[PDB]
Amino acid sequence: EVIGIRQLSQSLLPAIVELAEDAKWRVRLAIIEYMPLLAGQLGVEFFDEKLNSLCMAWLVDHVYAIREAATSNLKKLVEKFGKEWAHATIIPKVLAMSGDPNYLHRMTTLFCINVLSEVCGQDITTKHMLPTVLRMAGDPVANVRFNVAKSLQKIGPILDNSTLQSEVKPILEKLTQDQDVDVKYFAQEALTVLS
Amino acid sequence: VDDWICEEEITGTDALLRRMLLTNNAKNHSPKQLQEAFSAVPVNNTQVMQIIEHLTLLSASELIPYAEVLTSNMSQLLNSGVPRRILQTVNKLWMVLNTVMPRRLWVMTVNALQPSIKFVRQQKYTQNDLMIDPLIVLRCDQRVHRCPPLMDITLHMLNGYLLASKAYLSAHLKETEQTREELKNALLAAQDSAAVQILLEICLPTEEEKA
Amino acid sequence: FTKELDQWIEQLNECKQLSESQVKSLCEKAKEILTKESNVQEVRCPVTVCGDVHGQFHDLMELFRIGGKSPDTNYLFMGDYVNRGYYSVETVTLLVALKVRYRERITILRGNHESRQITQVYGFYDECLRKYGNANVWKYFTDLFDYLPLTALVDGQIFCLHGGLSPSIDTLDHIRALDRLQEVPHEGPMCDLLWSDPDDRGGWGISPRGAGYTFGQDISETFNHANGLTLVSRAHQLVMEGYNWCHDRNVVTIFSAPNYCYRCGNQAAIMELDDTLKYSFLQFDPAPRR
Ligand SMILES: [Mn+2]
Ligand SMILES: [Mn+2]
Numbered sequence: 001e002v003i004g005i006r007q008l009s010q011s012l013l014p015a016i017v018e019l020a021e022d023a024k025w026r027v028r029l030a031i032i033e034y035m036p037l038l039a040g041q042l043g044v045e046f047f048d049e050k051l052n053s054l055c056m057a058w059l060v061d062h063v064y065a066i067r068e069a070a071t072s073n074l075k076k077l078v079e080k081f082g083k084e085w086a087h088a089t090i091i092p093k094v095l096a097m098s099g100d101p102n103y104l105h106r107m108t109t110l111f112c113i114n115v116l117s118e119v120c121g122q123d124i125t126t127k128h129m130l131p132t133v134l135r136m137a138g139d140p141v142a143n144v145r146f147n148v149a150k151s152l153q154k155i156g157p158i159l160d161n162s163t164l165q166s167e168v169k170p171i172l173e174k175l176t177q178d179q180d181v182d183v184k185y186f187a188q189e190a191l192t193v194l195s
Numbered sequence: 196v197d198d199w200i201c202e203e204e205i206t207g208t209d210a211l212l213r214r215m216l217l218t219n220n221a222k223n224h225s226p227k228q229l230q231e232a233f234s235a236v237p238v239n240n241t242q243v244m245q246i247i248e249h250l251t252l253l254s255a256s257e258l259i260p261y262a263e264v265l266t267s268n269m270s271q272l273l274n275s276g277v278p279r280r281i282l283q284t285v286n287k288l289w290m291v292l293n294t295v296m297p298r299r300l301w302v303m304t305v306n307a308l309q310p311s312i313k314f315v316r317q318q319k320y321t322q323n324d325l326m327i328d329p330l331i332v333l334r335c336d337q338r339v340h341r342c343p344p345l346m347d348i349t350l351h352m353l354n355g356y357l358l359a360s361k362a363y364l365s366a367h368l369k370e371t372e373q374t375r376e377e378l379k380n381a382l383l384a385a386q387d388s389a390a391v392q393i394l395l396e397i398c399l400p401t402e403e404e405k406a
Numbered sequence: 407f408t409k410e411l412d413q414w415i416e417q418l419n420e421c422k423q424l425s426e427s428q429v430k431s432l433c434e435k436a437k438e439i440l441t442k443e444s445n446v447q448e449v450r451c452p453v454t455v456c457g458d459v460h461g462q463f464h465d466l467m468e469l470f471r472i473g474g475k476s477p478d479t480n481y482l483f484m485g486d487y488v489n490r491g492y493y494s495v496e497t498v499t500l501l502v503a504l505k506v507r508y509r510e511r512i513t514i515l516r517g518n519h520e521s522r523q524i525t526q527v528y529g530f531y532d533e534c535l536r537k538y539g540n541a542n543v544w545k546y547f548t549d550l551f552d553y554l555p556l557t558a559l560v561d562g563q564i565f566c567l568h569g570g571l572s573p574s575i576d577t578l579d580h581i582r583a584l585d586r587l588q589e590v591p592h593e594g595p596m597c598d599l600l601w602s603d604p605d606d607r608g609g610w611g612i613s614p615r616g617a618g619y620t621f622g623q624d625i626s627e628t629f630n631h632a633n634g635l636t637l638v639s640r641a642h643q644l645v646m647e648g649y650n651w652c653h654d655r656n657v658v659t660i661f662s663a664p665n666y667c668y669r670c671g672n673q674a675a676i677m678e679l680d681d682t683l684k685y686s687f688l689q690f691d692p693a694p695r696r
Binding site: 025062063064065101102104107142143146180181 | 450452471472473474475477478479480508509510511678680681682684686688690691
């Protein structure tokens with residue numbers, strides 16, 4: 001605030017980037033929290049060509065705290081740097097993450113869908129996330145299924161109504177009869193929420 | 196050496212056909228026309244056939260504008276029922292472009308031969324991206340594994356990027372000096388062997404071919 | 407009839423102990439849940455294996471921030487949720503509440519400190535006495551510890567147990583045939599199962615502790631080959647590095663308590679088995695305190 005973005009960017013930005021690769025995850029999340037701050041005081045192009053891939057790098061991090069911090073920061077960036085920019089930069093990496101074999105990356109994807117969908121606009125949200133979210137419902141891991149149910153419950157009211165009914169209702173009906181108890185409970189809760 | 200010996204004059208008949216057929220002023224065939232021919236709702240193999248057959252006559256310098264359309268639309272060549280001559284002439288044109296326009300042609304060709312189910316599939320495979328990880332070129336659509344022309348293309352790409360990666364990481368370790376050479380040699384041997392193993396597994400008949 | 411349980415989980419995450427009646431109801435529910443579990447609890451492959459916690463509650467929250475919040479992350483705790491810590495009651499209550507609420511998404515195995523005598527000596531009994539003014543909560547919890555499964559079995563390959571092997575145990579069927587609903591004896595199968603350690607040794611050996619045995623590399627090799635196990639996960643011993651492979655990658659000791667009595671300074675680690683058993687250890691340091 002007192003030095004200005006120009007001097008810090010010329011001076012401390014490479015050091016900040018080097019710190020972002022630190023071993024201690026607490027240091028990394030300390031670096032993470034300022035991406036909305038840096039984003040507000042800096043243009044979209046320079047952040048896109050310097051730190052966007054770095055922001056994506058945190059999403060695949062081992063520690064869960066790092067991943068959720070990056071997820072919240074992605075929410076901040078999309079509400080700050082616009083919508084079509086996120087479609088050009090952020091959304092392809094999220095879709096790539098949806099194909100990951102490891103389940104935790106898919107859960108990072110579902111949390112990303114949760115945070116983005118609130119401020120990603122109705123049309124973009126449906127026509128991008130919904131094919132991605134719906135395919136994830138057939139995953140063998142029960143964790144994935146109940147997280148899909150929770151995600152549909154959360155991003156329910158924010159999308160279009162015809163698509164809401166026609167897409168969400170059959171798969172939630174499918175999840176209600178799924179054998180795992182948690183999937184049953186969360187699918188029932190989602191159906192009650194949607195009404 | 197394959198690209199260089201490709202440039203070597205064989206008989207000079209190509210120059211004769213250049214001076215004879217290209218004088219027709221049928222050079223109205225343009226990259227936009229070829230792109231339109233590719234993007235027909237039916238396959239319409241006749242128009243693309245005539246255009247690319249004409250492009251074989253073009254010298255390498257003036258064939259640079261057609262690099263974008265040929266590479267971008269080569270994914271469409273993987274579909275069933277494409278004539279062999281289309282792929283053969285695409286192979287010839289790609290070899291010519293490689294002789295004069297190698298690096299960016301390789302970048303765009305790898306970007307084009309992505310699986311396409313992931314659509315963009317991280318189209319940011321720049322020159323450095325392939326130069327650090329040569330095995331990316333093997334991460335391609337399964338249909339090329341039984342498409343001999345584009346498979347030959349991919350093999351050229353793989354050899355080039357293996358050598359490129361060798362020189363690249365040598366230069367990188369030199370500039371980052373400010374032992375590691377043993378790790379360099381081990382990484383290179385591992386990378387070459389891994390490429391060989393992937394190719395050998397490609398040679399295997401799949402279960403469908405087994406069926 | 408589950409909103410109260412989520413409220414308890416939320417309350418426990420802020421390190422606020424439940425009342426005696428709440429603990430009684432929780433122990434009743436847990437007993438009605440644990441009785442339907444075999445001594446060798448089958449566990450699906452995607453699971454985060456965690457070692458000892460020993461009541462270091464803030465470090466348990468550190469572990470949760472590392473590996474994620476349940477039920478979104480499957481967990482598997484190999485005993486020692488009590489003693490050697492100032493927040494044993496909160497830790498064990500949170501783990502039991504998670505077990506009741508999300509029985510499929512978390513598995514808790516019996517430790518060697520899950521015993522009446524060990525709790526009486528090493529200060530879980532004293533902590534219960536201070537935090538509740540009586541021994542009723544300690545009685546309820548120590549009754550529950552009899553029902554905790556002795557071992558686990560991740561995807562039929564990874565064998566998770568708190569302690570080591572036993573000279574009289576050389577088959578998973580033997581472990582399944584044990585009567586776990588009892589106090590940890592001073593000898594015999596389950597005592598060794600909970601108290602034994604590996605060692606750079608040939609054959610068996612009397613443990614430096616007062617119970618169990620020390621088994622060499624050949625023992626673990628024969629056990630693994632006979633039972634078709636690739637790895638024997640274990641958590642009974644301290645590890646400065648956080649985790650430590652043993653016996654040519656046949657046994658790995660996982661310690662999930664950063665520090666051990668807030669003085670050892672050891673690191674911690676948790677194994678993370680993914681959807682195809684591609685393991686990965688996530689080490690972490692003790693969380694900052696006031
Ligand atoms: Mn122990
Ligand atoms: Mn212990």
